[PDB]
Amino acid sequence: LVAPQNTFLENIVRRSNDTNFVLGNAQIVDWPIVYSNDGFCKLSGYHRAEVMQKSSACSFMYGELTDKDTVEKVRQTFENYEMNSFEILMYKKNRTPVWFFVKIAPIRNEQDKVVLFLCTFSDITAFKQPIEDDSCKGWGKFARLTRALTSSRGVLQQLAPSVQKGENVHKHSRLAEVLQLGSDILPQYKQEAPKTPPHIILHYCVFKTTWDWIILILTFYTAILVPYNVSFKTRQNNVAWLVVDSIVDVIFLVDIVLNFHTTFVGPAGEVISDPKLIRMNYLKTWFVIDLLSCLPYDVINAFENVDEGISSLFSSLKVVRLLRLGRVARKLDHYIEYGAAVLVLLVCVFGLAAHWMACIWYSIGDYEIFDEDTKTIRNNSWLYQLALDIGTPYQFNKWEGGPSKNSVYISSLYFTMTSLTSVGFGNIAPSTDIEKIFAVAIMMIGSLLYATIFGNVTTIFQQMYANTNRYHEMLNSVRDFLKLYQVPKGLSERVMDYIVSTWSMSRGIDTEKVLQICPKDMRADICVHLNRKVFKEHPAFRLASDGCLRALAMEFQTVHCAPGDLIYHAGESVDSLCFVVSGSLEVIQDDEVVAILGKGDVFGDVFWKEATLAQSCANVRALTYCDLHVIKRDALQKVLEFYTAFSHSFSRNLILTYNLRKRIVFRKISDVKREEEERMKRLPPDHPVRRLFQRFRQQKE
Amino acid sequence: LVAPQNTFLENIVRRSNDTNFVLGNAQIVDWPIVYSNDGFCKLSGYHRAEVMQKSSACSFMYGELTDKDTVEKVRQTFENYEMNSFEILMYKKNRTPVWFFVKIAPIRNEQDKVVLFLCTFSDITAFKQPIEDDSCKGWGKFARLTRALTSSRGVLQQLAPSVQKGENVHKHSRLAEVLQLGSDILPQYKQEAPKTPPHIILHYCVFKTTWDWIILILTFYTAILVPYNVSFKTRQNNVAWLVVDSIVDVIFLVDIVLNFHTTFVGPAGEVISDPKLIRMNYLKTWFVIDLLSCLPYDVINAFENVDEGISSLFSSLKVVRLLRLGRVARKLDHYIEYGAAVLVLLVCVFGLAAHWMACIWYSIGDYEIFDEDTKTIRNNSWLYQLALDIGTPYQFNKWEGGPSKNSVYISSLYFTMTSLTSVGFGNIAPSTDIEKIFAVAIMMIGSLLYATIFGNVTTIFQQMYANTNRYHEMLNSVRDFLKLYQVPKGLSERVMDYIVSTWSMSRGIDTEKVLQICPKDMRADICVHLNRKVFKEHPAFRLASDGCLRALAMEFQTVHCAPGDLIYHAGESVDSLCFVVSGSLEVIQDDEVVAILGKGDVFGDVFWKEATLAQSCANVRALTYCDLHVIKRDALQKVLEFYTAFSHSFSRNLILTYNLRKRIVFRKISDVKREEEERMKRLPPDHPVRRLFQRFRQQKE
């Protein structure tokens, strides 16, 4: 989410440290100036526009005291493209001769070419010999030159008055700030994305995504396992549990380390990648909590110490890595956001709450069943009830254990579960006060959890139906309109066929909306792409310029059509030129076929010549599914008159297939036979019709 | 929700009591008139427009009989800004000389300045000596003057014919209505919000809001506690319950008093704050109910009287303060309305209904268990069943009590609860007829309550997803369109990058919609703010007037762009001026870099000079993320020709960085070397090409 960016001006101005620079082209003869810094503009007194395009040699800066040897040296250093520095008198706009130190640095290109020359300048007037062509006084001229030397007199040499013979180090101090420009020359005219530090890996790499999926699976597995072991306090018989616990805790610590070594996205900035601040930000935000939550705290339980009862609660506290997950959810859900991702999040929280409240019901029962050394059986307890139900009742002499831990686990799970979805079988009763308060807490939280899933599942029916409903409402309105206004079957089915076909090919595409969203130049490129067919195939466009091509692409509109469609009916005013790129067309003149139109054909009229609109002499009808491109007369004329140069070539190259303004005369064989046989079968009062004949002859004259 | 308002005209006209007044400026020499009342307009006969801007001295009113002493007195009283009153003959528009009483009152300003002079006038003709320059008759002139004196003859002196020598009090009666104007002078030209009475406190103060939160918590606590004590009829063992009950009832009475002393909002008026009506409105609407509901009625139970069984039902009746809360809800919910406030309202009504129906189930059981002195155990009762289930069965000799009240409370709560959410454990059965009807009532109301929460929770998924769905549908349509029309990868990713970046930076912002919602002047201010950058930094605008600045701000449009974007391709018609405020730009001429554009640069053409559009000679492309401001030629020309004065300064100050109409010529070093080595390696039939050469020379001539 970043563009190949160029930063040369900002980089060079920031590296300059209040110095000045001038830029000029390398490959053009005499190397014209392409840029001048504001500092140079003010130092020379000449404006940027008047220094623009001038020669890099700065001959326009020269004066009588300039050195032909220096001129030759700058000339040959330009012609050989090496780094150098110089010292020479130069003339300001007031034609005051003043001293200058100069350095040159041509800049290479990413293509290993060399494109640019870079210049730097500095005053040394207050330190060189005094010179004055004309002055009010020698001391006054000295003071004025020293006050002009403020650039050197500033931070670059502010310590000078505390020392003597400072010129032994002032030259090097000035030269270092220009020698630093070698780093500025590095990008070599290239515009490119900035770099990021190593050992901090981009968060969006596929390897990091599968790492995120792995830590997902790990935290889900730990959230399963933890409440089980902590509730039942089972014996550590197989070392595998401790092995898995320690490895998964250390892999979580490594995950925290990679968050400490990975890119992060902030609300105030699209990408944040500086190690010097990302680590501290991650710390101060959430890294302290991550450290508080993700260590292998079970090592304390594995070891032995005087910390009686201190470290027990670590397991549920470290389950919370689901909260790291929830922070990641903002991104990770979007891989299934299409698909209602929250469905899995629901299922997971269901399972988690079920297991949690299973262990809670177990804990309450276990705490209640025996009344300590008082030996009160408390037969009212649910666990006693289930023990007697399943058999193997308790005994004493000593105590019998009755039910087994596995069966009792599933007992608790199943009660939690039935409470969760309100089926309430009722075989296992919450007899005691605290059992029965816990029943409050569980079924309340269950109902709140329960409402959400109905909302979630309803959230998809809009997608599943509303599009069809939009189609349905337009179709129903069309039906009512069409039937209400009594359109016969032919035109009615033509209308509905057009509606259904165009809707099938379109649906949700808003092509005009996409166009107007698109910015002007990309719009130009899109329409050029869409009219590429006619542009390449028709020879009239083989000569066009890119600008006129773009404008014509804006103007062009493409029409698909069904067979039997009538494009130009007789007597209609022709106003458009049109091309055929698919299908075929036919022309009807006086109910007679006179022309057929195929691929690549173009017909219309010479608008640029006639300049007057005319009626259509014939009818043109489709016989195939055809694609056509049409152009309006006025816009075509405007583009043509703007591009007069292309206009002449376009006029002389373009030839039409048929011209709608002209028409042909003909005779039918049947009509000729009728006339011949009528002649085979074959006036003084006709003076009025003869007068009409004479009038017609005069009009035709 | 009120603006700093001015009411001087309405206030003074209402205080005037049918008198007249005239206003004039204080700080302008000769004090021109700024306003004239309609009464004065009609009394003088001169129209408002012709009296406008005239001198406050009313010299244009004067006549031969006027007094130079009075003229000097009004002059010096104006020059010294004191209050005074006067009497003088003046002339009406018909040039009839008539008597006038006059009073003057300059008005101060909120800045302790003085800005305005106020005048008042009145006729005394019928009481002063008779005067007539020319008349039909003396008695007729007397009658006409008396009929002109109707202003004094009206309500100000209507009692005069019942008295004699009334002039001893008529002057004071007239003067009082003008002396009242001192209160009218109070606001001192200031426009400000009106005042509200003390001891009635604004309802929206933060202290009042936290008071509302406190009364919320109090009524919630009382609603918890009341059905418990009233159902179980527990002994009053700790005085703390009575203490809390009495303090909370009296704090509710104090709350009712503060509603009686606080602002209230009515549908017919945005703010209602008059004590003389707000108290009565609050009374007649709801204050009678508040008094009916909020007293410490438990004092009767604490005391002793012959009122056997009268005062018991007070507690549930005073719980209803949740209805005061519900009236407040219209406002109070909106602090959590963002956040689906109704969720807490649900949770609260849940808890309330649970506890209520707990106490109801308890009441039914307690009423049923024992069949009075008949000693029928009624073992069918649910409470008997639970007693035998838990143990400690009932006994007699005398009666054993069995279950304890705490356990029985939670029993009832828990049954109500399981009935509420239909889990229906079934261990506690409604055996008896009435138990079992109550089961009807509870589970019916439970299902009605239950449906609401699903609606509530579904109400959020639109917010959670529909925005993403809008983005999804446009992206899907773009994908289908782009792939269907076979755009290569380069342009395809350019398009999708533009779409996603613009959508990320925009989302729900409809900037154009905000603009068109905004009214014209604030639109002007917004665009001035947005173009402040160019306005302040570019010297050409340092001279502009506010009106032309506003119009140009309306015209300006800003464009952000990505690197590689081509603004003006070669051969395109230049029609816009444009400025650079961010990033950098580069210019390509004949595939050669010729110019670079930086911060603050401007390029285009001199439209106001050339007046003819021209094609672009070069190409300009972006290398950085850049922000630009563009101006259309036609609107710029129109604004300039309107503001001709600024036009000359703008033309003479403005200088372009590069002009698209002009172009540069150059040569390549490689091309020069090729030509030189070709010359190192180096016509009669050429007459046709020589003729072309001669034609070219003639055309260039």
PDB file of C-alpha atoms in Angstrom, chain A residues 2-6 9 25-29 31 34-35 47-48 52-53 115 189 191 337 342 415 422-426 428-430 433 436-437 440 443 447 450-452 454-456 458-459 508-509 511 514-515 517-522 525-526 529-530 547 550 642-643, chain B residues 407 410 414 418 421-425 427 450 453-454 457-458 461 465 477-478 480-482 485-488 491 494-495 498-499 563 565-573 584 586 592-596 598 601 613-615 621 623-625 655-657 664 666-669:
ATOM      1  CA  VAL A   2       2.700   2.431  -1.141  1.00  0.00           C
ATOM      2  CA  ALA A   3       3.760   3.857  -4.483  1.00  0.00           C
ATOM      3  CA  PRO A   4       7.205   3.983  -6.111  1.00  0.00           C
ATOM      4  CA  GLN A   5       8.056   7.405  -4.786  1.00  0.00           C
ATOM      5  CA  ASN A   6      10.639  10.046  -5.619  1.00  0.00           C
ATOM      6  CA  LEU A   9      14.222  17.547  -3.897  1.00  0.00           C
ATOM      7  CA  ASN A  25      20.862  18.184 -17.913  1.00  0.00           C
ATOM      8  CA  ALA A  26      23.779  15.953 -18.875  1.00  0.00           C
ATOM      9  CA  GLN A  27      22.850  14.555 -22.302  1.00  0.00           C
ATOM     10  CA  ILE A  28      21.797  17.854 -23.939  1.00  0.00           C
ATOM     11  CA  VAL A  29      24.522  19.960 -25.550  1.00  0.00           C
ATOM     12  CA  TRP A  31      23.892  21.282 -20.508  1.00  0.00           C
ATOM     13  CA  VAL A  34      16.847  22.451 -15.199  1.00  0.00           C
ATOM     14  CA  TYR A  35      16.616  23.737 -11.621  1.00  0.00           C
ATOM     15  CA  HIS A  47      15.263  34.998 -10.727  1.00  0.00           C
ATOM     16  CA  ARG A  48      14.544  31.308 -11.309  1.00  0.00           C
ATOM     17  CA  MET A  52      16.120  28.609 -16.260  1.00  0.00           C
ATOM     18  CA  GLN A  53      17.338  26.841 -19.393  1.00  0.00           C
ATOM     19  CA  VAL A 115      21.206  12.346 -16.624  1.00  0.00           C
ATOM     20  CA  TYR A 189      16.840   9.516 -10.737  1.00  0.00           C
ATOM     21  CA  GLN A 191      11.412   6.824  -8.046  1.00  0.00           C
ATOM     22  CA  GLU A 337     -15.438 -11.686   6.197  1.00  0.00           C
ATOM     23  CA  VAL A 342     -18.215 -14.098  12.801  1.00  0.00           C
ATOM     24  CA  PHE A 415     -25.581 -29.895  32.080  1.00  0.00           C
ATOM     25  CA  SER A 422     -32.477 -23.919  27.234  1.00  0.00           C
ATOM     26  CA  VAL A 423     -33.585 -27.455  26.340  1.00  0.00           C
ATOM     27  CA  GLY A 424     -33.490 -28.132  30.084  1.00  0.00           C
ATOM     28  CA  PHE A 425     -33.877 -31.907  30.203  1.00  0.00           C
ATOM     29  CA  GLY A 426     -34.258 -31.698  33.980  1.00  0.00           C
ATOM     30  CA  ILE A 428     -29.936 -33.283  36.811  1.00  0.00           C
ATOM     31  CA  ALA A 429     -31.359 -30.738  39.241  1.00  0.00           C
ATOM     32  CA  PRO A 430     -29.595 -27.773  40.887  1.00  0.00           C
ATOM     33  CA  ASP A 433     -28.612 -22.708  47.003  1.00  0.00           C
ATOM     34  CA  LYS A 436     -28.970 -22.831  41.840  1.00  0.00           C
ATOM     35  CA  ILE A 437     -27.580 -19.265  41.852  1.00  0.00           C
ATOM     36  CA  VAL A 440     -28.995 -17.964  37.255  1.00  0.00           C
ATOM     37  CA  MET A 443     -28.702 -19.165  31.813  1.00  0.00           C
ATOM     38  CA  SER A 447     -29.544 -16.016  26.591  1.00  0.00           C
ATOM     39  CA  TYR A 450     -28.021 -16.882  22.178  1.00  0.00           C
ATOM     40  CA  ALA A 451     -29.498 -13.666  20.747  1.00  0.00           C
ATOM     41  CA  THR A 452     -26.325 -12.842  18.800  1.00  0.00           C
ATOM     42  CA  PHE A 454     -29.895 -15.032  15.201  1.00  0.00           C
ATOM     43  CA  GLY A 455     -28.671 -11.548  14.365  1.00  0.00           C
ATOM     44  CA  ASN A 456     -25.595 -12.998  12.652  1.00  0.00           C
ATOM     45  CA  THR A 458     -30.142 -12.879   9.567  1.00  0.00           C
ATOM     46  CA  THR A 459     -27.291 -10.649   8.369  1.00  0.00           C
ATOM     47  CA  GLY A 508     -24.688  -4.917 -10.624  1.00  0.00           C
ATOM     48  CA  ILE A 509     -22.311  -3.284 -13.117  1.00  0.00           C
ATOM     49  CA  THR A 511     -20.343   1.181 -16.039  1.00  0.00           C
ATOM     50  CA  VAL A 514     -17.074   3.245 -12.737  1.00  0.00           C
ATOM     51  CA  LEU A 515     -16.174   5.755 -15.453  1.00  0.00           C
ATOM     52  CA  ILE A 517     -15.192   7.335 -10.383  1.00  0.00           C
ATOM     53  CA  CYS A 518     -12.154   6.846 -12.619  1.00  0.00           C
ATOM     54  CA  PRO A 519      -9.944   9.946 -12.997  1.00  0.00           C
ATOM     55  CA  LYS A 520      -9.529  11.687 -16.330  1.00  0.00           C
ATOM     56  CA  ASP A 521      -6.266  10.137 -17.558  1.00  0.00           C
ATOM     57  CA  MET A 522      -7.191   6.580 -16.590  1.00  0.00           C
ATOM     58  CA  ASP A 525      -6.648   4.912 -21.139  1.00  0.00           C
ATOM     59  CA  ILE A 526      -9.781   2.798 -20.548  1.00  0.00           C
ATOM     60  CA  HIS A 529      -8.394   0.236 -24.680  1.00  0.00           C
ATOM     61  CA  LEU A 530     -12.095  -0.237 -25.453  1.00  0.00           C
ATOM     62  CA  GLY A 547      -4.008  13.472 -27.924  1.00  0.00           C
ATOM     63  CA  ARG A 550      -7.588  10.152 -26.455  1.00  0.00           C
ATOM     64  CA  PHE A 642      -8.752  21.378 -33.234  1.00  0.00           C
ATOM     65  CA  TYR A 643      -6.452  18.803 -34.866  1.00  0.00           C
TER      66      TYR A 643
ATOM     67  CA  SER B 407     -33.797 -20.550  50.381  1.00  0.00           C
ATOM     68  CA  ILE B 410     -34.151 -17.996  45.789  1.00  0.00           C
ATOM     69  CA  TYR B 414     -35.220 -19.326  40.119  1.00  0.00           C
ATOM     70  CA  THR B 418     -36.502 -20.627  34.280  1.00  0.00           C
ATOM     71  CA  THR B 421     -36.367 -18.066  29.394  1.00  0.00           C
ATOM     72  CA  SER B 422     -38.265 -21.310  28.725  1.00  0.00           C
ATOM     73  CA  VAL B 423     -35.494 -23.682  29.833  1.00  0.00           C
ATOM     74  CA  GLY B 424     -38.135 -25.278  32.062  1.00  0.00           C
ATOM     75  CA  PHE B 425     -36.033 -27.569  34.240  1.00  0.00           C
ATOM     76  CA  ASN B 427     -38.070 -30.051  39.128  1.00  0.00           C
ATOM     77  CA  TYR B 450     -38.187 -12.418  24.740  1.00  0.00           C
ATOM     78  CA  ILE B 453     -34.123  -8.619  22.435  1.00  0.00           C
ATOM     79  CA  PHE B 454     -33.643 -10.465  19.159  1.00  0.00           C
ATOM     80  CA  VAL B 457     -29.552  -7.225  18.747  1.00  0.00           C
ATOM     81  CA  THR B 458     -30.335  -7.562  15.029  1.00  0.00           C
ATOM     82  CA  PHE B 461     -25.744  -5.765  12.111  1.00  0.00           C
ATOM     83  CA  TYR B 465     -21.854  -4.836   7.731  1.00  0.00           C
ATOM     84  CA  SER B 477     -18.695  -4.799 -10.262  1.00  0.00           C
ATOM     85  CA  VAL B 478     -15.309  -3.192 -10.963  1.00  0.00           C
ATOM     86  CA  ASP B 480     -16.261  -8.028 -13.485  1.00  0.00           C
ATOM     87  CA  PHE B 481     -16.146  -4.946 -15.733  1.00  0.00           C
ATOM     88  CA  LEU B 482     -12.342  -4.787 -15.828  1.00  0.00           C
ATOM     89  CA  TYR B 485     -12.966  -5.866 -21.051  1.00  0.00           C
ATOM     90  CA  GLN B 486      -9.525  -7.473 -20.958  1.00  0.00           C
ATOM     91  CA  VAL B 487      -7.472  -4.627 -19.479  1.00  0.00           C
ATOM     92  CA  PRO B 488      -3.796  -5.644 -19.116  1.00  0.00           C
ATOM     93  CA  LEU B 491      -3.682  -0.434 -16.224  1.00  0.00           C
ATOM     94  CA  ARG B 494      -3.572   1.280 -11.667  1.00  0.00           C
ATOM     95  CA  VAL B 495      -7.384   1.332 -11.700  1.00  0.00           C
ATOM     96  CA  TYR B 498      -6.872   4.274  -7.436  1.00  0.00           C
ATOM     97  CA  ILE B 499     -10.220   2.777  -6.394  1.00  0.00           C
ATOM     98  CA  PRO B 563       3.640   9.447  -9.023  1.00  0.00           C
ATOM     99  CA  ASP B 565       0.370  10.628 -13.318  1.00  0.00           C
ATOM    100  CA  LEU B 566       0.322  12.662 -16.533  1.00  0.00           C
ATOM    101  CA  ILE B 567      -1.451  15.996 -16.065  1.00  0.00           C
ATOM    102  CA  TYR B 568      -1.011  17.572 -19.515  1.00  0.00           C
ATOM    103  CA  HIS B 569      -0.123  15.229 -22.349  1.00  0.00           C
ATOM    104  CA  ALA B 570       1.410  16.635 -25.517  1.00  0.00           C
ATOM    105  CA  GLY B 571      -0.957  18.148 -28.062  1.00  0.00           C
ATOM    106  CA  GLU B 572      -3.750  18.656 -25.529  1.00  0.00           C
ATOM    107  CA  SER B 573      -5.581  21.982 -25.356  1.00  0.00           C
ATOM    108  CA  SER B 584       7.176  17.835  -7.242  1.00  0.00           C
ATOM    109  CA  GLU B 586       8.656  17.099 -14.086  1.00  0.00           C
ATOM    110  CA  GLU B 592      13.721  14.777 -22.837  1.00  0.00           C
ATOM    111  CA  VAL B 593      13.465  16.236 -19.346  1.00  0.00           C
ATOM    112  CA  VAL B 594      13.429  20.014 -19.747  1.00  0.00           C
ATOM    113  CA  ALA B 595      11.931  21.384 -16.518  1.00  0.00           C
ATOM    114  CA  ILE B 596      11.317  20.324 -12.924  1.00  0.00           C
ATOM    115  CA  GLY B 598       8.638  22.196  -7.010  1.00  0.00           C
ATOM    116  CA  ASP B 601       5.448  26.672  -8.650  1.00  0.00           C
ATOM    117  CA  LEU B 613      -6.621  28.294 -26.609  1.00  0.00           C
ATOM    118  CA  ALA B 614      -3.476  26.411 -27.605  1.00  0.00           C
ATOM    119  CA  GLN B 615      -2.213  22.840 -27.685  1.00  0.00           C
ATOM    120  CA  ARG B 621       4.359  13.872 -15.097  1.00  0.00           C
ATOM    121  CA  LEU B 623       7.254  11.817  -9.395  1.00  0.00           C
ATOM    122  CA  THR B 624       5.906  12.310  -5.838  1.00  0.00           C
ATOM    123  CA  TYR B 625       2.574  12.345  -4.046  1.00  0.00           C
ATOM    124  CA  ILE B 655       4.882  35.344 -13.401  1.00  0.00           C
ATOM    125  CA  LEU B 656       4.677  31.731 -14.559  1.00  0.00           C
ATOM    126  CA  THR B 657       7.325  29.073 -14.009  1.00  0.00           C
ATOM    127  CA  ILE B 664      12.487  25.014 -26.494  1.00  0.00           C
ATOM    128  CA  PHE B 666      17.947  21.668 -28.320  1.00  0.00           C
ATOM    129  CA  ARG B 667      20.423  19.089 -29.589  1.00  0.00           C
ATOM    130  CA  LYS B 668      21.720  15.823 -28.160  1.00  0.00           C
ATOM    131  CA  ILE B 669      25.434  15.251 -27.614  1.00  0.00           C
TER     132      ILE B 669
END
